[PDB]
Design a protein around this nucleic acid. Structure first.
Lengths: 207, 125, 267, 108, 114, 130
RNA sequence: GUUUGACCUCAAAUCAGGUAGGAGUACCCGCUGAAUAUCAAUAAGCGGAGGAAAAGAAACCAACCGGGAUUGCCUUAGUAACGCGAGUGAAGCGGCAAAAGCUCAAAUUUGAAAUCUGGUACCUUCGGUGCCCGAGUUGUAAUUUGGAGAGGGCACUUUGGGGCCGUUCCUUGUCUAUGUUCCUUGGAACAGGACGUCAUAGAGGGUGAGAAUCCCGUGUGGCGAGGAGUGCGGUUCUUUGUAAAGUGCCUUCGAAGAGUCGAGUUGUUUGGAUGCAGCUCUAAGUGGGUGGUUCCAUCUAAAGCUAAAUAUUGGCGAGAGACCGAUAGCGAACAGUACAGUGAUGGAAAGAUGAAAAGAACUUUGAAAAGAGAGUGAAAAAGUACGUGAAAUUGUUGAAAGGAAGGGCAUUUGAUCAGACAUGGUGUUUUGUGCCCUCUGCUCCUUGUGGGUAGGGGAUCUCGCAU
RNA sequence: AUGGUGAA
RNA sequence: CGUGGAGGUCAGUGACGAAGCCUAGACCGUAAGGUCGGGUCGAACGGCCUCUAGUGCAGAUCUUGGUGGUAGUAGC
RNA sequence: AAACUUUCAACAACGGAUCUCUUGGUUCUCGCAUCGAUGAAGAACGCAGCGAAAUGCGAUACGUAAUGUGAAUUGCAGAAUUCCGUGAAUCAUCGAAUCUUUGAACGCACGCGCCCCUUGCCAGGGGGCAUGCCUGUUUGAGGUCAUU
């Protein structure tokens, strides 16, 4: 708050009183009188270098560089060793990159989508998620950042028919479109090699 | 995950609402699940509790105890069960405060309003 | 408000104390002139101590304990990798137990082998002290025939008189319970059974709730029909454990950490 | 010092307002047909751009009146004159295409 | 506990006044003692007075039935600013020329595909 | 602010209004045909394309007839007063079809209507009656 | 008429029907306004409105093959321009957001002041009707606002009001899934393992410690109840009256804001030389204003209304934070309260017991402080001075040492702490086993220098293990 | 400097 | 080297005890510091790659809060 | 030597420093316009059985009127309830009332008047009488014109 600290009437005593020259609140009886004010070093004072609202928050990024990063993140998913180094339990996936029939997009119930993911080989990653769920460490416990968990498998689709809603409830699993292919989702934490599941229609549309 | 934009998941707001909720809302808050035998009978999972409702203890040191309820302390969010009382050093008996969420109703008290609510909630009698 | 709550209760406690003191003074003054009223009030007010609120075969003795017909030989050893503290405690064990033979642990002779060797040598009981740090933590006693044994935890070991060569007199207290009298019988059959009262040496075992206090004292009587006593050195407290009822098989009472919640029944 | 944190909020509000207009103005396209314009300032005269509304002469040549044209979604500007045959012909053709593509429901 | 308003609705003015007088006498008698009954009689007095006021207000409304410029007490309490801000009829008032123009060329509904 | 704190502390209670979700949802209220075919899942531009209609007449900024038939089909879904009729009948009887003579009738053509108006009204009357 | 009437003017009535102050104030409008150029059309002060306000449809921008309400953003642009010094600093064009045009003065309704306020009685009551009263002629209605427009004639085209149900919006209630299963520990399981179920619902909170499945809640839909309105789809009664408009043609006419523009001068603002402002004078109608090489380009000022994109530290109601965490964050998490000042004003300190009070029953010493027993309690090393209890400082026990102490190099003495559940490895000799020998099988890929798993027969056996 | 306070 | 917060990873640590504090205990490093042995404590915190800053105190006749000699002294 | 000065291990006091948390503050984003003579904001006095602060209320006084919920409130006493019911809550909604004295503050002032009416010379009982200005009704006075 800009008005914080300024809500005090104090003036420097100058000299002769054998005390610090920091301005002190006038009056008497209350007890706050005679205490330092307007000083960053003073209790309840005006903090030095207050954080203003016009500080830079967003970073401009060249569109070409953004596309380069997305392409690199997408390519990194093709290497099983790189994906393994990312922490995903892809040790049992039948093939990499994982290609599935378009009928997966037509699944409406989470009970069927989770079963299909388990059958295809994503069971290990789904078990890894819902297990690493640990309470937030630090002051984030009470800032809506109460819980945290490891990222799960990423599902890429060409058209939406209900899979996005069926898979939203299962923890760790995220759904994205081929057109978007979010970099923040492909390489969370700036670390390449996320486990991504692609549909054959999405695989063709990638070209 | 929540999709409605009119509902907030803020911990502070929810905590403030829970503690400042009025007695009318606290009545809904102080719900208690019905016994599996009663669930099949009435086809309902839980209903608001009241004085004459008979409840069973499923948690705490008094697990396995049962008795007729005598008071619903909405201010303290606790309910009292007959025969479930503490013994002070001076011999005075003080009922132990229990939470309805940790108790199972074994015999409901039937009134016209309760019967209407049962039908409203998809139950049967 | 913290200030309001603190101020309200601070004044309340002062008034309560004032009222209590005035009532006590008036009651004492009126009882001085009416002694019987004091007795009635005392009868009507019980202190409700924890002790007052407790929540509710000759063949066996001979077969599972030593008897005067044959003095018991007790085999004394220590757990493997023992150190100075264990031998220091064994010194007191020798000083207090009647007939002890100390043998170094051979580190590989199984408990069955030790029992067989002791039977070959006609030993009566086995006692082994165990240590973790440079301190005694537990003690065990086993009888050879039929293998009745008890395991005891050791705590508060403290090293003032010099005991004489006389055998101290044995006294047991608070062993009414069936389980308690079993440990009492064990102590009565493991310690010397032949008193030599001359020399005024006494050994006492005193259980209160679950711990038994072992101490030695010299007792001298006076014309006032009272006996004074003086500490005779070591302080000792023990806690029964695992009540095996066999060499290692068929435990009967082994304690569990989940107990002690009831606060009573003083096993 | 003003920081445009609401940029996303402003865009969302504009989209919501457009959606509300569409809901109220569902049948119509939310826009009035505009004429082609050649800019002054030769630096930009090569660029052709949309104007405010068609001139009265163009509306007359299109076979309809300004009062009727406005009710059909045609912007009318009585301030702009006409001094180019090509622009006039293009505006007339655009108006004719608009008239041939519009569908008007009966008032009954 | 206490009197019921739904029972007092149909009582006459004289009966309501007599009941109020009796309740006031009971309250005065109870005041000498100084006792939940005092609260009950106090609530009954308020209920009787409210019923009497409601009857009087409806009678006043009836006597002013339909005629213009009723007493300000019975008038709307919405707000000061809403008595101004000309009413719906005044706002909707439109000149004859504008109405003729609208009728001649009403806003039409149309779509642009073909 | 002081008033906000007073309201929060007051027992009156806030006049809560939850309408954030209603801003996103807008129901069509200007056409019955569009409402039946409109899909709220798609956007305005997407809905217009699905219906087969243009949502913009000018070149839109930035990058980018099974239903219109119903609209086209939807496109396929005054007399004279008694005193006016009597006045017309009087003049018709007095002068028949002689419009020029009828024009100069001083005591029957009270209003000096033109020949065109008189003949049009007479033709309308004849068509309506005979 | 040594009177009686029309008005006009001026007063009054406890007349009937109405409105005005003030509060709040972040944003808006006007006036004023400091610490010759700069802080500055800022700070402070006064007056006037709303949810936005102002402005708004050119006497405009431009000199182009021209654009055409106002407003906000980028660009124009840190350029033109100025004070050429420090420095101030535009605007057209271009792209974007949103687009809506209108109302009077002006020329006769004169074949009908056709207009309107109020009173009265009704009805279908944000209003309508019959009658009366008064205003209006020193102009109330329709017809025209430069895009022209108006009186006529010729082929034509068109048309509104009130109720009902739905529709949409606001308020608001309700229905809509799954364990509290087993074992370990704990005072309490919401902790770990096993077995399970729902997920368009694993956002969040409470429940004796980290809960999807205990509850409240959330996702999607259904069912309701009370108000707004005609944004519109049906439904029902009405129109009407020689009524009002539009299209093309022919014909006769065809108004335009004066103490105003403008010049002079004096104060004021601008980086603009413009504008604002006291006052002498005071303009014309094929006229007037704005711009350049003979003038050519564009409008018609001296009246007014109008949603939109625009601001918002106040108000109400909501969704969030890479924000702060009781010496931080608003001065105030329990306060504009206590308190100080004759006064305008200044202005603090203070969060947490314990699951629950189960808040120490009772005995006992004290006029009184609180002590000692005793017990409650997971813990009282949690006892309302209560979540945890370090320094500076203070008292006791012990060790040491004595007009000083403090630190560094090396060591003695005193005290005291660590100091392997290490108990192995190798070759040989009995005996029992298997994944070991032999026979008979099954099963996964691919296909391979494999893996997994069974039923009969023995100690050729150290291939491993145990003795 | 702006706006107020009391004081002969 | 260390701290507040954030993205990622340890299917991390933890009522069979996380953080803090104490500790004439030990280990590691030239050090910022980390780690372990023992006591109180109770419920959250950490191994590592990056991002972020109201990020590190010995003093500023420094601010708040607390406590000593002066001193059981001047004095009442 | 004892006593006493000083270093340290333990014990016993201050204070809440470190750690954990909050019905808090601050900042960002979105929907709307909602004070007043039909009496705004603000101030004083009273009201709960027991009452410090806060909140609510106005002699109908921690409320009266109406609808929804259906069995309470709670620190103590007290109430009941026909609780299978037009019915309790310090509950929610809130459209109907009451709304003390001041305060734009409104009878005249810097104490203190008038219309009204009433149930019994005289009085209880009930509402009003402030200033600026707009429309209409009533009365009074004065300049022009008419007056055979």
């Amino acid at each position: 708050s800009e008005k914080a600290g300024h809500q005090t009437s104090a003036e420097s005593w100058g000299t002769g009183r054998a005390v610090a020259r920091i301005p002190r609140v006038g009056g008497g009886g209350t007890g706050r009188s005679g205490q330092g004010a307007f000083g960053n070093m003073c209790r309840g004072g005006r903090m030095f270098a207050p954080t203003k609202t016009w500080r830079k928050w967003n970073v401009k990024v060249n569109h070409n560089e953004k596309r380069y990063a997305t392409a690199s993140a997408i390519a990194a998913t093709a290497v099983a060793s790189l994906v393994l180094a990312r922490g995903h339990r892809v040790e049992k996936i039948p093939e990499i990159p994982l290609v599935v029939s378009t009928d997966l997009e037509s699944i409406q119930k989470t009970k069927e989508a989770v079963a299909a993911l388990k059958a295809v080989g994503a069971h290990s990653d789904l078990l890894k998620v819902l297990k690493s769920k640990k309470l937030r460490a630090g002051k984030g416990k009470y800032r809506n950042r109460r819980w945290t968990q490891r990222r799960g498998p990423l599902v890429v689709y060409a058209e939406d028919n209900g899979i996005v809603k069926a898979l939203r409830n299962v923890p760790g699993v995220e759904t994205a479109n081929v057109a978007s292919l979010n970099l923040l989702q492909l390489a969370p934490g700036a670390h390449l090699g996320r486990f991504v599941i692609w549909t054959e229609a999405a695989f063709t549309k990638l070209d | 995950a929540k999709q409605s934009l009119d509902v907030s998941s803020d911990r502070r707001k929810a905590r403030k609402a829970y503690f400042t909720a009025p007695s009318s809302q606290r009545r809904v808050l102080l719900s208690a699940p019905l016994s599996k035998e009663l669930r099949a009978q009435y086809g309902i999972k839980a209903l608001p509790i009241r004085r004459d409702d008979e409840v069973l203890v499923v948690r705490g040191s008094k697990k396995g105890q049962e008795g007729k309820i005598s008071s619903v302390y909405r201010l303290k969010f606790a309910v009292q069960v007959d025969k479930v009382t503490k013994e002070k050093v001076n011999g005075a008996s003080v009922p132990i405060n229990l939470h309805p969420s940790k108790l199972v109703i074994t015999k409901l008290h039937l009134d016209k309003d309760r019967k209407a609510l049962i039908q409203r909630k998809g139950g049967k009698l | 408000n913290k200030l309001k709550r603190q101020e309200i209760f601070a004044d309340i406690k002062h008034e309560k104390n004032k009222e209590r003191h005035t009532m006590r003074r008036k009651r004492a003054k009126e009882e001085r002139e009416n002694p019987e009223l004091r007795e009635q009030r005392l009868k009507e007010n019980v202190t409700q101590t924890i002790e007052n609120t407790r929540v509710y075969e000759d063949d066996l003795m001979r077969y599972f304990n030593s008897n005067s017909n044959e003095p018991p030989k007790i085999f004394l050893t220590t757990n493997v990798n023992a150190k100075k503290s264990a031998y220091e405690f064994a010194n007191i064990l020798i000083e207090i137990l009647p007939n002890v033979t100390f043998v170094k642990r051979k580190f590989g002779y199984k408990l069955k082998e030790i029992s067989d060797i002791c039977i070959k040598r006609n030993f009566t009981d086995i006692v082994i002290i165990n240590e973790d740090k440079k301190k005694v933590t537990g003690l065990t006693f086993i009888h050879l025939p039929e293998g009745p044994t008890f395991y005891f935890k050791l705590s508060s070991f403290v090293e003032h008189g010099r005991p004489t060569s006389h055998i101290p007199e044995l006294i047991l207290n608070n062993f009414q319970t069936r389980l308690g009298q079993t440990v009492g019988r064990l102590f009565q059959s493991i310690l010397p059974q032949n008193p030599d009262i001359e020399g005024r040496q006494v050994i006492t075992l005193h259980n209160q709730r679950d711990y038994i206090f072992f101490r030695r004292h010299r007792y001298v009587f006076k014309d006032n029909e009272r006996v004074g006593l003086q500490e005779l050195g070591p302080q000792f407290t023990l806690k029964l454990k695992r009540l095996q009822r066999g060499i290692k098989e068929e435990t009967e009472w082994e304690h569990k950490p989940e107990m002690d919640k009831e606060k009573k029944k003083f096993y | 010092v003003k920081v445009h944190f609401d940029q996303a909020g402003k865009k969302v509000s504009r989209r919501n307002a457009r959606a509300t207009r569409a809901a109220k103005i569902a049948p119509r396209p939310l826009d009035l047909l505009r004429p082609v314009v050649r800019a002054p300032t030769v630096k930009y005269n090569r660029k052709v751009r949309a104007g405010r509304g068609f001139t009265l002469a163009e509306v007359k040549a299109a076979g309809l009146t300004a009062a009727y044209a406005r009710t059909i979604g045609i912007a009318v500007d009585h301030r702009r004159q006409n001094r180019n045959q090509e622009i006039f012909d293009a505006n007339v053709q655009r108006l004719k295409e608009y008239q041939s593509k519009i569908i008007v429901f009966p008032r009954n | 506990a206490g009197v019921k308003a739904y029972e007092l609705r149909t009582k006459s003015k004289e009966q309501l006044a007599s009941q109020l007088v009796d309740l006031k006498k009971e309250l005065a008698e109870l005041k000498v003692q100084k006792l939940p009954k005092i609260k009950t009689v106090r609530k009954s007095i308020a209920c009787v007075l409210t019923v009497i006021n409601e009857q009087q207000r409806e009678a006043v409304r009836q006597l002013y039935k339909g005629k213009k410029y009723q007493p300000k007490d019975l008038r709307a309490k919405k707000t000061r600013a809403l008595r101004r801000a000309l009413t719906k009829f005044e706002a909707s008032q439109v000149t004859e020329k504008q109405r003729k123009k609208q009728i001649a060329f009403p806003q039409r509904k149309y779509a642009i595909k073909a | 602010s002081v008033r906000k704190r007073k309201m929060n502390r007051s027992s009156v209670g806030k006049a809560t209004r939850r309408n954030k979700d209603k801003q996103r949802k807008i129901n069509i209220q200007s056409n019955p045909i569009i409402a039946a075919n409109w899909d709220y899942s798609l956007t305005m531009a997407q809905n217009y394309k699905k219906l087969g209609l243009r949502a913009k007449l000018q070149t839109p900024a930035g990058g980018k007839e099974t239903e219109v038939v119903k609209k086209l089909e939807e496109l396929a879904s005054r007399s004279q007063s008694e005193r006016e009729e009597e006045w017309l009948e009087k003049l018709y009887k007095k002068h028949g079809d002689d419009y020029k003579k009828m024009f100069f009738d001083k005591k029957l053509n009270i209003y000096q209507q033109s020949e065109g108006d008189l003949k049009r009204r007479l033709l309308r009357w004849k068509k309506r009656n005979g």
